[PDB]
Amino acid sequence: RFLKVKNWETDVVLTDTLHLKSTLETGCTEHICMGSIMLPVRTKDQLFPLAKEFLDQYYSSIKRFGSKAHMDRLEEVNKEIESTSTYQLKDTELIYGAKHAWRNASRCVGRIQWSKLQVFDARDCTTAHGMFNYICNHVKYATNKGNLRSAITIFPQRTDGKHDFRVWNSQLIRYAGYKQPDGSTLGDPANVQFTEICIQQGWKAPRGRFDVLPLLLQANGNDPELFQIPPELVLEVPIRHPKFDWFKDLGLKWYGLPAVSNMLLEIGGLEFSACPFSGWYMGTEIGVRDYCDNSRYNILEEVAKKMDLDMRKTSSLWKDQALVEINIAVLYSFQSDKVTIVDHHSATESFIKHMENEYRCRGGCPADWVWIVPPMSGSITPVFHQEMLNYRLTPSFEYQPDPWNTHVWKG
C-alpha cells in the first residue's frame, strides 16, 4: 500500500512505503484526528519479537542480514532473554539505535543531522554522582565553546522498573521559575514546579530571573540528589539587537545548549529512561516561544512599548512587529558570539531536502506538521506547504511521566 504526499507550492508528489513498518498507535481513528493533541516492565514473551525486529533492522543496515553473525546474535539474545529476562545491546547496536530514534523523531525539524551524533555509553553508571560526571562531560563536549555538537548520554536501562535511572530536570540547562506571593512569576514560569522540588531538596535558590537550575539525579531507583553544573561549563548568550541599542537593557540572555533530559529512548524493546540528548537551537524556540508565550517570559508588551508601536488596537499588528525584532535579536546575538543557531527559513528548507532524500532512500519520513511548522511566519517556510505523514517507528524517543509523580521515596 502506497501513500502520496504533495507539496502545494511545487506540486512535487512523494510516495510513502515506510509507514508499512510502523507498529505503535497514533491516537487517531478512522473517525477522529488527534494530530493536534500534545500527548495522545515488559515480559519475555513480548520482548523477543521486539529484539528480533530491531536486530533484523540493524543487520540489514550493515548489509549482513541472514549472515551467521546475524543468526548467532539472534540466538545469543534469545538465550539471554530466556535466562535473565532482558538483554544487553552491543555498543554498535546502541549507537545505531540512538541514531535511529532521532531519525524517527517526527516532531524534530533538525533531522538532516541524524547521522552525526556522538553517543556516550553511560551504561556502567551506578550512582547519581556517577551520572553528574557523565552529564558534565556531555555538556562540555556538546558546547565545544559555541561550536555545538549533537550528543546523547545513555545510562543503564530499566530492569524491573523499581531501579530506574532518571534525570528529573526536563532539560540539563534551564532557568528557575519562582511563584511570588502576589501571583506574578520571577524567572521561567515553565519551571516553577521543578524549581520548588529543587528548593525542597535543599537547593539555595538565588531567586533571580535567569538562575541555572541544579541537576536532580536519580540512579538505580534511589532518591534523587542535587548537583550544580559548573557555571564555567554553562554557555550563555546576552541578547542584543543590531539596530536597537535599548534592547540589551531588557536584560535578556539565554543558554546555548538545548538538551532534552526527560524522554525515554526505546531500542529493541529495551527502555532507556535517562538518555539526555542535545543539538542546537532554532532561533524561534527562544525568540518566539520562550520569550513571547504568555505562559513564559512574556516580553511582547515591554518590547512593543520600547519600540513605540500602536498598542491600542491588535490590528496595528504590534505583537507581530515586536516579534520579528525579538527574533532578529536572538539570531544576531548567537551569531555575534559564535554560538551555533539556525534560523527557521534555513532549518525548514534543510528539512524539506532531508525529507525528500528520506523518501527516495528509505521510502518515507514520518513528520508531525503541527510541530515541524515554526511558530512564527508559518507559510513563508516551505514546510507549511508540505503534506506530511505522521506515524510511529522504533527505535524512538517517547514521553514518560514526570518522576515526582511515580517515584517511591526511600527516605
Residues at the contact surface with a copy of itself, assessed by CB under 8 A: 3, 5-6, 8-9, 19, 22, 25-38, 283, 288-289, 292-295, 300, 314-317, 319-321, 323-324, 327-328, 331, 335, 343, 345-346, 368-370, 373-380, 384-391
Cα–Cα nearest to 402, from 177, 204, 224, 199 = 224
Q: Does 285 bind ligand HEM (CB under 6 A)?
A: yes
Grouping H, G, I as helix, E, B as strand and the rest as coil, residue 5 is strand
Q: Where are the beta strands (DSSP E) in 288-386?
A: none
Q: How far apart are CA 104 and CA 95, in angstroms?
A: 14
> Does residue 108 carry a catalytic annotation?
yes
CB of 356 to Zn ion, least distance (A): 23
Residue owning grid cell 514518560: 400
Q: Does 259 bind ligand JM7 (CB under 6 A)?
A: yes
CB of 292 to a copy of itself, least distance (A): 6
CA 296 to chain centre: 18
Q: By Cβ distance, which residue is nearest to ligand JM7? A: 285
Q: How far apart are CA 397 and CA 169, in angstroms?
A: 16
State which of positions 339-358 bind ligand HEM (CB under 6 A). 342, 347
Beta carbons within 10 angstroms of residue 53's beta carbon: 15
Question: 268 — phi, psi (to 5°)?
Answer: 60, 35
Longest Cα separation, the chain: 74
Catalytic residue among 280, 292, 318, 358: 280
Nearer to ligand HEM, 86 or 278 (CB): 278
DSSP 285: I
Please name every residue paired with 277 in a beta bridge, in sequence order, or none if there are none: 152, 260
Of these, 3, 12, 19, 28, which contacts Zn ion (CB under 5 A)? 28
Cβ-Cβ contacts under 8 Å for 147 (sequence gap 6 or more):
338, 340
Of these, 77, 109, 239, 329, which contacts ligand HEM (CB under 6 A)? 109
318-336 and 300-307 are packed helices; what angle lies between their axes, rounded to 10 degrees?
Answer: 100
CB of 102 to ligand HEM, least distance (A): 4
Catalytic residue among 103, 111, 158, 166: 111
> Does residue 111 carry a catalytic annotation?
yes
Residue owning grid cell 505523514: 389
Q: Per-residue contact track with ligand JM7, 268 to 307, x per CB under 6 A?
A: ---------xxx-xx--xx--xx-----------------
Q: How far apart are CA 236 and CA 311, in angstroms?
A: 32
Nearer to ligand HEM, 65 or 399 (CB): 399
Residue owning grid cell 534560523: 343
Select from 25-33, 77-85, 202-210, 233-241 the region that touches Zn ion (CB under 5 A): 25-33
Q: How far apart are CA 190 and CA 295, in angstroms?
A: 7
The residues assigned a catalytic role are 108, 111, 280, 285
State the residues that interact with ligand HEM by CB under 6 A. 102, 105, 107-110, 113, 117, 150, 152, 260, 277, 279-280, 282, 285, 342, 347, 371, 397
State the residues that interact with ligand JM7 by CB under 6 A. 108, 110, 171, 258-260, 277-279, 281-282, 285-286, 289-290
State the residues that interact with Zn ion by CB under 5 A. 28, 33, 35
